[PDB]
Design a protein around this ligand. Structure first.
Ligand SMILES: [Mg+2]
Ligand SMILES: [Mg+2]
Ligand SMILES: [Mg+2]
Ligand SMILES: [Mg+2]
Ligand SMILES: [Mg+2]
Ligand SMILES: [Mg+2]
Ligand SMILES: [Mg+2]
Ligand SMILES: [Mg+2]
Ligand SMILES: [Mg+2]
Ligand SMILES: [Mg+2]
Ligand SMILES: [Mg+2]
Ligand SMILES: [Mg+2]
Ligand SMILES: [Mg+2]
Ligand SMILES: [Mg+2]
Ligand SMILES: [Mg+2]
Ligand SMILES: [Mg+2]
Ligand SMILES: [Mg+2]
Ligand SMILES: [Mg+2]
Ligand SMILES: [Mg+2]
Ligand SMILES: [Mg+2]
Ligand SMILES: [Mg+2]
Ligand SMILES: [Mg+2]
Ligand SMILES: [Mg+2]
Ligand SMILES: [Mg+2]
Ligand SMILES: [Mg+2]
Ligand SMILES: [Mg+2]
Ligand SMILES: [Mg+2]
Ligand SMILES: [Mg+2]
Ligand SMILES: [Mg+2]
Ligand SMILES: [Mg+2]
Ligand SMILES: [Mg+2]
Ligand SMILES: [Mg+2]
Ligand SMILES: [Mg+2]
Ligand SMILES: [Mg+2]
Ligand SMILES: [Mg+2]
Ligand SMILES: [Mg+2]
Ligand SMILES: [Mg+2]
Ligand SMILES: [Mg+2]
Ligand SMILES: [Mg+2]
Ligand SMILES: [Mg+2]
Ligand SMILES: [Mg+2]
Ligand SMILES: [Mg+2]
Ligand SMILES: [Mg+2]
Ligand SMILES: [Mg+2]
Ligand SMILES: [Mg+2]
Ligand SMILES: [Mg+2]
Ligand SMILES: [Mg+2]
Ligand SMILES: [Mg+2]
Ligand SMILES: [Zn+2]
Ligand SMILES: [Zn+2]
Lengths: 246, 52, 100, 81
RNA sequence: UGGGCAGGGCGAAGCCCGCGGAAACGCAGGUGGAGGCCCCGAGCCGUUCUGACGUGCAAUUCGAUGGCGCGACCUGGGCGUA
RNA sequence: UAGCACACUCGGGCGCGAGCCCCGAGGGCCGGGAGACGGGUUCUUCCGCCAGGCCGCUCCGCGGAAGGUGAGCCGGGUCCUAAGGACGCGCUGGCCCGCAACCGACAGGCAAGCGGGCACACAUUCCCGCGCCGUGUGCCAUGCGGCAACGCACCGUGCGCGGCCGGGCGCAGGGCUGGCGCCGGGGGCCCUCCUCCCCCGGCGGCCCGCCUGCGGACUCUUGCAGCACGAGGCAGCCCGCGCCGCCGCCAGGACUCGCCCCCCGUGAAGCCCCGCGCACGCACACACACGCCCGUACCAAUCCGCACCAGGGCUCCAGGGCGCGCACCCCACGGCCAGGGCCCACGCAGGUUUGGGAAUUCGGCAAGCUGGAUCCGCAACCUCGGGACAAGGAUUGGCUCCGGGCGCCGGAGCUGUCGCUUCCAAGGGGAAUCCGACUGUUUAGUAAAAACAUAGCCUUGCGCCGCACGC
RNA sequence: UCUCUUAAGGUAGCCAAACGCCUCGUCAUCUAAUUAGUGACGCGCAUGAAUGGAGCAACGAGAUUCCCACUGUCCCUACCUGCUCCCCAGCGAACCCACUGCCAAGGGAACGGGCUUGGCGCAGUCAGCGGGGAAAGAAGACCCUGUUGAGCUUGACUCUAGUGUGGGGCCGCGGCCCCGCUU
RNA sequence: CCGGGGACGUGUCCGUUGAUCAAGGACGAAGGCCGGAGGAUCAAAGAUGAUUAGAUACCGUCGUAGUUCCGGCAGUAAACGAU
């Protein structure tokens, strides 16, 4: 049969274009505390979360840094990017100097990585605790995953601006159309059950049905990994996270 | 990418200096990375007797 | 009426192919190339219109005299007077309390 | 001359999309289109410019906020500390 | 990266005034001009006639009828995917 | 034989030869004129034809001989980047991939040319007039006014920091276009009537709007509103639109500023350039000199469909009337018109058919009815938004007036063989069921659908991702 | 109420439905008359819950029935117009083609233009026409056969990319398989 | 922290401003509903183990909605002092 569309979208000519990206949004790696001014809060194509253009002026040069905008950023805000700066909203500092229970965002995964986690709209990471021996901070990710990360990792205080975008329903197909055209998603999505067998494992005959269990193994071949790819369970949840995970 | 260009600068990896004009820069870097590795290994008495 | 032709030129409706009608002496009208509208100078801070500076195309702007392209005070075609005065007050007052 | 008794701003959507979907988006379209008070100049002139960016049209004070409100509950809590 | 797309109709918020109200607010008249709203022009398409044609004008066209017609559109060029 | 021109007609001409070539007249018809791609000499002149053109030809996109394409300003290159490519090197057994010089736009960014003449044809290229832009040489000054908004010394180089963009209803302006009135040329027509018909006619002040000064609280807009972070007013300033000084009045208009609206869409980049900041050191004016390569004719029968094919093919420009209307229809501009005779049957296309009215038929297929506008009236149902132009009714011309808030609206009277959206244009409606929620999409060439898509709802994986409101 | 049996025995709903074989189910309505339509009924061959059930506001060139109005759809046709046809000048093909006077019956490979026995017609022309030539199109697409395929599927056979696992190789130091370290 | 309340005390003020109510408005336990978050216990439904003549119940175990919070709907109680 032909190559399914899942494998066929993995080819690198289907990725979003690089010219839509305003710039890489990394927390600056600084020796001393860096004082910046939020120069502009800009929009990026596809990204609902806005970006914060941070202009840093020294004696020598002007550095132009880029961060994802925090809810409460404003143009002209003095931001401080350092190791032990104040823990106001908009600053970026190492997690050891961040008190527990404060929602941070653009958290680095490795130290001086530039910020990886909680980068899209409304996301934040709750700093749960500090292991001051072994230099380890346990943090709560927006998926609910409790993640260990080293206290040398930086993070920006606050939640990601761009708020509750999931609350608004797309009423029309056009609003899904222009959304996916901006983000570069593959849309509209034909159900594989509506396809022919040459197109899809769900591609069937005479009645639109799957025909075999749609829970596939995680060791499956690519081309078989279609539907629910490592499903621990299925069906409607109806329970707490505790009752379903175990 | 600017972070990666800083990343290949922090590590001093001679395999990053892959262009032709970087050749004399690369073999200077190879000479010092060999020298740090040569003396961090346990030099056997057959080689180390020439250090005396 | 005498119909208009782009007289051997491209007929597309781009910003750089705008035409304007001239009445030629024979009660004949033609298209002549209407140039691009010149950009208005704006304050770099507050982005209001800056007065004093001429509004022309960036090439025709450069052909003007140096007095027509700017205002005589400092941060002349960059800042308006209200943004400049604020910038003077900000650098002064930050310096004064820095001493205390 | 009210025009509509119950739907208000979602009368633009007509009879389409379902009553509960029109009822759900009504609170957000009131929220994302409203003018808000600028906390830098005092005037009720803050309008959304794009999702996540709210700008006062009087004193040009622009700030990064929520998607369809200037403030979210998670965003308010981090700033109140 | 450029370009193209009559004229009407309905009248969403908001606003103004009048009337009513103890209040909350409610009616009414304007205003405003929203919407993958309505009829439709150029144009596009291809519902029906199972029309014409069916060694054709044409290796899919023609006519009437019909649908769409600021879009989830159409389009020139460049580019990508074999 | 099938088939092939059958809105033209009359006179004249050249000519061996004329339905078709030319000229004049009459009658009609519809596009025509500029660019791209594509063609490549088809262009234009002279000569021809007994060949080609679905007939004929004296004609021709044909045959023969010639002629023609002139640029600092038009387009491209000598410029810049876009998406993207990449022949080098790394990684290789080879790719992929990494870096990526270089490249990538004849519609992006983007120095500067218009009016006319000439001409067989070609010229925004030649010519004439008036300009403009850039480059290269020379030749240096070393600053001021205004409280302010700012005004100016026609000056340079380097660095740093900055500096451009969407769509839409409306308001206002508006390249221009039309109409009317009045005046003015120029040309043609008229039994009566008719003033018929055709053509032509920088600079200063003010106004916006921002800002400034005085001053201190009001003030709009068609519209939300604005305003002590300074209202109106007055006096200025700035820079544009606009109007007067060196034919009026009315209407339409491509386009455009700003408000406002729309977006889970936020609407390029780079060079050039400009501004300021900080430095350097000097050349704008003026004068003189100079300005490369390529393209440049023509193509509603010149292209692609084997063809002068009823097909297809990017872009620009429509005057008058009617009317809501760049709808239809008529006219103008500009351009056109490709056998003869007879009409039997059966056709194709179009009218009309008394009485009946779906009895026809698988089925109201096809045809017909309704149709614009104004006024009135409008149900069940409903997601309260709709249904809805529901259903249904009345009216509609011409003329002469009257009134108004006067592009229009209302009323009255008179009038015609009762007739008036008089042509054109232009919904048939109701009661229900099934399915799909809707707008949308699809089998180019037998299926447009109930299929697909959709939003919504849900499940799954993922914290080595574009970073969980994510993919 | 009893009993057998299953993983569980179809719940809420809905229905001769685009899903009901019987079947034109039965009853009502619609009609003069209805295998249609609608409303009911449900021991439903074989309805049924995101393989989504029920649900129709709005929408639809979707599928269907009734009513009003309308009409050449029909009773049942007629007339008119243009173009064709027809006739001509000039120009001028193709399909097809074993050979071809026409019937009746018979025989025959069981449906003849030719054979047999009868019946007829023949100046070979013009125009209509569609009975026949089992007319022309096209080495039947149905069906079967082929030890001829291809598309596609999976509990076919034999393999295989991918995912995953074990062991080994991948020349480093330290300390107690574990923990440090970096080179 | 912000807000409220009644009683008392008083040569403080006002001076009849009041009482009760169709209409109207606001609040309104539990359960329920909508959107979002969360989910330990308990627990409708459901599932079982028993009891029983039967047991769709009482008992045991498990378990979803729910119980919880936020925004709203709803607007009911043996909302009883049946006043
Ligand atoms: Mg299919
Ligand atoms: Mg498959
Ligand atoms: Mg299937
Ligand atoms: Mg299905
Ligand atoms: Mg399978
Ligand atoms: Mg030319
Ligand atoms: Mg000036
Ligand atoms: Mg529409
Ligand atoms: Mg329509
Ligand atoms: Mg199509
Ligand atoms: Mg003939
Ligand atoms: Mg003709
Ligand atoms: Mg032309
Ligand atoms: Mg010629
Ligand atoms: Mg000849
Ligand atoms: Mg080469
Ligand atoms: Mg160009
Ligand atoms: Mg010249
Ligand atoms: Mg010419
Ligand atoms: Mg003022
Ligand atoms: Mg007109
Ligand atoms: Mg009749
Ligand atoms: Mg019938
Ligand atoms: Mg019958
Ligand atoms: Mg019948
Ligand atoms: Mg019909
Ligand atoms: Mg009506
Ligand atoms: Mg109805
Ligand atoms: Mg549909
Ligand atoms: Mg088809
Ligand atoms: Mg649903
Ligand atoms: Mg049942
Ligand atoms: Mg029946
Ligand atoms: Mg019937
Ligand atoms: Mg289920
Ligand atoms: Mg089913
Ligand atoms: Mg549709
Ligand atoms: Mg003949
Ligand atoms: Mg016989
Ligand atoms: Mg015989
Ligand atoms: Mg014959
Ligand atoms: Mg026959
Ligand atoms: Mg065969
Ligand atoms: Mg065999
Ligand atoms: Mg409650
Ligand atoms: Mg509750
Ligand atoms: Mg809930
Ligand atoms: Mg329990
Ligand atoms: Zn300013
Ligand atoms: Zn403000």
């Amino acid at each position: 049969s032909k190559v399914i569309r899942r494998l066929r979208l993995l080819k690198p000519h289907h990725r979003p274009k690089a010219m839509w990206k305003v710039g890489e949004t990394r927390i600056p790696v600084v020796s001393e505390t860096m004082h910046g001014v939020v120069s502009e809060i800009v929009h990026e194509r596809g990204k609902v979360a806005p970006l914060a253009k941070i202009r840093v002026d020294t004696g020598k040069c002007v550095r132009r840094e880029l961060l994802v905008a925090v809810e409460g950023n404003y143009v002209g805000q003095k931001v401080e990017i350092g190791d032990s700066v104040p823990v106001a909203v908009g600053n970026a500092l190492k997690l050891k100097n961040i008190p527990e229970g404060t929602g941070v965002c653009s958290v680095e995964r490795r130290p001086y990585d530039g910020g990886k986690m909680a980068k899209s709209s409304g996301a934040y990471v709750t700093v749960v605790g500090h292991n001051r021996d072994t230099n380890i901070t346990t943090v709560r990710l927006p998926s609910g995953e409790k993640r260990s990360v080293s206290s040398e990792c930086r993070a920006v205080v606050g939640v990601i601006a761009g708020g509750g975008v999931n609350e608004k329903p797309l009423l029309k197909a056009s609003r899904a159309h222009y959304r996916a055209k901006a983000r570069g998603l593959y849309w509209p999505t034909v159900r594989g059950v509506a396809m022919n067998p040459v197109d899809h494992p769900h591609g069937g005959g005479n009645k639109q049905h799957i025909g075999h269990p749609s829970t596939i193994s995680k060791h499956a071949p690519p081309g078989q990994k279609v539907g629910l790819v490592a499903a621990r369970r299925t069906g409607l949840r109806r329970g707490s996270k505790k009752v379903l995970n175990k | 990418s600017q972070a990666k260009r800083e990343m290949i600068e922090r590590r001093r990896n001679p395999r990053d200096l892959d262009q032709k004009h970087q050749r004399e820069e690369r073999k200077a870097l190879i000479a010092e990375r060999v020298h740090l590795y040569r003396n961090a290994l346990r030099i056997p008495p057959a080689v180390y007797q020439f250090s005396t | 009426v005498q119909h208009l032709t782009h007289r051997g030129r491209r007929t597309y409706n781009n910003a750089s192919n705008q035409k304007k009608i001239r009445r030629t002496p024979g009660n004949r009208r033609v298209y002549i190339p209407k140039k691009k509208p010149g950009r208005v100078p704006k304050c770099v801070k507050c982005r209001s219109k800056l007065r004093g500076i001429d509004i022309c195309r960036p090439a025709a702007f450069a052909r003007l005299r140096k007095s027509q392209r700017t205002v005589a005070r400092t941060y002349g075609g960059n800042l308006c007077g209200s943004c400049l005065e604020n910038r003077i007050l900000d650098a002064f007052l930050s310096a004064e309390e820095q001493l205390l | 001359s009210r025009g509509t008794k119950k739907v208000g701003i979602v009368g633009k959507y007509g009879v389409r999309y379902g009553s509960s979907l029109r009822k759900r988006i009504k609170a957000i379209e009131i929220s994302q289109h409203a003018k808000y008070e600028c906390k830098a100049c005092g005037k009720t002139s803050v309008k959304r410019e794009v999702v996540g960016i709210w700008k006062c049209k009087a004193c040009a004070f622009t700030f990064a906020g929520g998607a369809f409100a200037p403030t979210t509950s998670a965003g308010a809590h981090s700033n109140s500390i």
